[PDB]
Design a protein around this nucleic acid. Structure first.
Lengths: 63, 47
RNA sequence: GGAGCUUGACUGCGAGACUUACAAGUCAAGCAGGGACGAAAGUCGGGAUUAGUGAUCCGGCACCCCCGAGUGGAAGGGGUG
RNA sequence: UCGGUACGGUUUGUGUAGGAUAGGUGGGAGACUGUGAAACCUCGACGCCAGUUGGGGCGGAGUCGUUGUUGAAAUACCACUCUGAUCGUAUUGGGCAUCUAACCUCGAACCCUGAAUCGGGUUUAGGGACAGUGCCUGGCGGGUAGUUUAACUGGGGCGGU
RNA sequence: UACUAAAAACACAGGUCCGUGCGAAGUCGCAAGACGAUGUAUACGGACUGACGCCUGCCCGGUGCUGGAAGGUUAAGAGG
RNA sequence: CCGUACCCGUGUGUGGGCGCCCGUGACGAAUCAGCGGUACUAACCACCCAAAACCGGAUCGAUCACUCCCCUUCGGGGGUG
RNA sequence: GCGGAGUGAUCUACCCAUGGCCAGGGUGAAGCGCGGGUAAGACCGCGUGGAGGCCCGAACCCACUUAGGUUGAAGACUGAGGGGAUGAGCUGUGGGUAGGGGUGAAAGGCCAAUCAAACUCCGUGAUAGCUGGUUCUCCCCGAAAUGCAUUUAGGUGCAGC
RNA sequence: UAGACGGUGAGAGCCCGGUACGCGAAAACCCGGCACCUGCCUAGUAUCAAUUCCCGAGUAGCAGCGGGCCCGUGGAAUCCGCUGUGAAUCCGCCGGGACCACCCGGUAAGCCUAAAUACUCCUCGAUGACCGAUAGCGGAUUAGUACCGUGAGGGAAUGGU
RNA sequence: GGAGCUGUCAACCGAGCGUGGAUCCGAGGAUUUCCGAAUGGGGAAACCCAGCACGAGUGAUGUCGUGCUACCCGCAUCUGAAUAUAUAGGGUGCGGGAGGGAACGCGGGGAAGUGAAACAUCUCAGUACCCGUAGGAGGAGAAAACAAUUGUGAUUCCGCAAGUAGUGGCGAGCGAACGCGGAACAGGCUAAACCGCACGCAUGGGUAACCGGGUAGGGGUUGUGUGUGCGGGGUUGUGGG
């Protein structure tokens, strides 16, 4: 998604898309948001986390 | 990265030899099975 | 028009004036270096003259102890062409 | 599987020098007697009964430098051979896959919702490492957006400059 | 076409063509979510044409759009 | 307001009917021996679904050596096999 | 005119929900029965029927010609003749769609009396090489409308005066 | 200590309110004053080889795309974002404008932290070479009023016996 | 405080009070309808209609007076489904926020007209505007700072440095810091290490090598680690623990 990571407090980032003639217009950088299923512990109900990838690898880790 | 198994698997092997996981194949496959740990204080509780 | 031998189709300059809105343009005696041609005098800093070219910014290719962001370097810059 | 690259090995071309035709070779002028047996039909990446290098085995005691009449040829001891076929320990781009466990399901049933065709959880079936999405990216795009589209002039335009 | 144009324009019923296999394609939003439709190729979207009668000739070069692997070119990435 | 109504609810009294309640009636449930409908299922099969290595039967081009003959412009074209 | 944020569907365009309305005549479709015709059914004649984006024509809806209006009675109207009038009709209520957007049987028409992008507040006192305006007195001096260049020729920079 | 200012029938230190200066308070708020309550330390501070561990992680770095800096990606460091890949713990990392060696400064990926700083809806005190009813607030006068617009919004005029 | 007063346009009629201290002035309290975040539910804001619980009223409902009843997040507590774990949720009880105010602050998004004699980079401008969020101020702040050899030693703010170096379709323009002078001057707590208790998995099913520390016994004893919870410890660059 274009979303914002839950735990990481991560969010989008704005800026510019500078074509060759330097015509800069606004594109936004997004965090890499996947909708992982996060059990509390083995046996939980793994609800849903729009969480980034820098918080899939390390940081919070369930799935 | 070495880790600490619970059951012998054709990728990971025994419990405590040398682990060569594929970067995600653990927490999406192994850690639901309760057969693998992301090593934090496990290299000596393994002993 | 022809015949000889050559590279001045030079490096550093330049009094002076032509003209000029400014930019640009043009001539330039003569000064030195080191050359050509000539026995020498001298002439040669392109063609009988006037067109054949474009400013600036910006990159490029070489030479130079010019600078070199702690210092030695360097990249980058700088002058010259 | 195509095929890889580091590699732990059996280790590669009837062009001249011919018992002998081994990228270079070489701590040495056998790894002492201390090798995969010149006995048979010998028929293989060469296949050319010739092969220094040779496939299934040898009068269970000898292809020898120094019986080289050749680059010193006795290099399965130094080059642990270029190591062609690769023999398997790894890596590991692609080619194709099968699988499920991520992930996607307006496919199914149940639960607090019975106050519900939204939600969420659970089992369930299906896909399934695909799509989607993020960051990078080639293309394409009047679909929208900002803008350009000169002057002269005997009005302007056309022509020309 | 309020407020100078009522028309030969627009629409139409009819005809094709193109797309869509179904949380459709198309459209509105960035998305969810909607409409399309509680429809399902005899349906829906788009383009042209325009009851009906006789018919709709020639051209695939240009450009679309459609399907095609000898390839060349090929940008971030791999790479060194 | 007059006359006459209708509707929703409330309080007090009266009639009988019903029924809780002791009092009769409608039935109807228990574990145990027998047995059934065969519903259901540790095997398998009747029928038929479907697909496997592996032997394969027609498809062919824009595929590679064949060259069996064609003009060539150093390059291609027919057709089994 | 350009941008940001809003405000507007009480007019108008379309749509959604629920209601209302259309005098009066006329034409006579499908159908049904009858006399049938016809081996049969098609068809005719009858009766009944009551159909239509049917006909004429009031209300209602529009607005075709025309005269009048034109500092109107009226910022779009009036008189007479007009088209529609069971329909792709009119109309009521309530609601929905909003500005590069809506809606549009399409005219670039309507979106609150000026829509090829509404209106309002803000950037804002936009900006114009263009136009207009610039207010009291006298004394002295006193031009130019040429050159060159110019996206320049009604501007300007430099010179000239 | 009072000749500020304003009023009174004119131009008032001495008529009035006041001023100069002095008093001024229950309660409130607040300045602050002492005692109570709570908050520590029952030496390892020193010197010691340095035997060992730690000094803030998907973070720093590096590559990709941007932002930002005088620095317009240029050759650019420092810093910040998003995406990959992805570290160490002092003999580590960081900076010193690419980068490298030596030399210096500091130890990021925890947080907190008064002052000087700006500000004016509001009350008090004051002043003006500020305006004096077309001025000055849009608003002296029932003012954001009447009126205008559907709405957002616009928006006056009006003082003197 | 002391003689009038009954606010005013706007001055008219009333009818009253006041020297027992009135009007009047300051501070504190009570009352404080209805709407408005508006919050019981609804709503054309200022109105419609309720639940429970007290408390009136009628013969009896109807009626009346008072209080709570919104939502969300956080916490305490019972709870705990599909399904057992257990969460999701689900009651309960306290605590909180919400909305506004002229500006000033920080974080994020972020134009255009304009200028560039056109225009696109650039400007305009981080501007207007938009969103988030608090404060009496905010932010920043305590060196992973500058400096270049004599170094200074948190931040902030004012004057210069300076229209300077630079940077710019090197156009229009944009433009620091080094460094000095000043206002003021304040530094601290943490995490990491380890030591200590606790739960829960691993460990022992004990012989464990450890019981405040030294030898000898000594119960054979929980010695020993882990996922966290808490208590000390520690806070630094002359490196520090």
């Amino acid at each position: 998604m274009a979303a914002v990571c839950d735990i990481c407090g991560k969010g989008p980032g704005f800026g510019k898309s500078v074509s060759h003639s330097h015509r800069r217009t606004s594109r936004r950088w997004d965090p890499n948001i996947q909708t992982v299923h996060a059990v509390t512990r083995p046996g939980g109900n793994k609800k849903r986390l729009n969480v980034c990838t820098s918080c899939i690898k390390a940081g919070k880790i369930t799935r | 990265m070495k880790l600490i198994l619970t059951a012998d698997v054709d990728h990971l092997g025994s419990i405590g030899d040398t682990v060569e996981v594929k970067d995600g194949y653990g927490r999406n496959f192994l850690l639901p099975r309760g057969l693998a740990i992301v090593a934090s204080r496990g290299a000596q509780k393994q002993a």
